[PDB]
Symmetry: C2
Subunit: 120 residues, 2 copies
Amino acid sequence: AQEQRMSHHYATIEVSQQLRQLLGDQLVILLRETPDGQALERSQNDFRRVLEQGRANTVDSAEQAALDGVRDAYLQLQAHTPALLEAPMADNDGFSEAFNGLRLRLQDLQQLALAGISEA
Amino acid sequence: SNAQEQRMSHHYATIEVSQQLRQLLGDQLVILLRETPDGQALERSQNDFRRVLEQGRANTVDSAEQAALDGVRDAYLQLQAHTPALLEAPMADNDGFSEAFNGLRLRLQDLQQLALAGISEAET
């Protein structure tokens, strides 16, 4: 029974990693000199998709409720996003690219450590 | 046995370093997304990120994880090099996006901690 709780919790961990990556993707776009609204649209649709997939197959009350909380907060973020497109945030892509570089390395470090735990 | 337990401890430790660094990076973004970023708050957050990172570089037993942290260090110095532009020419019109981003990233951090706990427990 411990292993069955395990694979379920790992799926949830993967959902949370995908959502964090997608939020990161959106921030990278929004921080560019000239954000691409269609890229932003795709990334938002992707976030909602991963969240809904996750909500539909999580069979654990605490994690269902956490996902509901993520949805609630995400809808608010989405509502404030157009004001960032309408008026860009940077004079060049410097910060966006530096941010992207760092956050990818941090994501990779977490995944590397998670791996060390799995195969053990 | 005992060995494996020590290894788990090591990996979970790196997970926590990475969680802390991600939270601290998020703190800096929350500040920079504000209409009037507080430079002093940002400096304190930068100092904390460096401290956590440097302790991690010194204390991380797994060789691959330690190497990864050098990569994080390199990328962080690049982020710092590009930070004054956003600090000194803030272009956000209000705090809406910043506050909403903070709310969301905290809920995501909560989701991840909850999932990790489930893995931790099922691993015993």
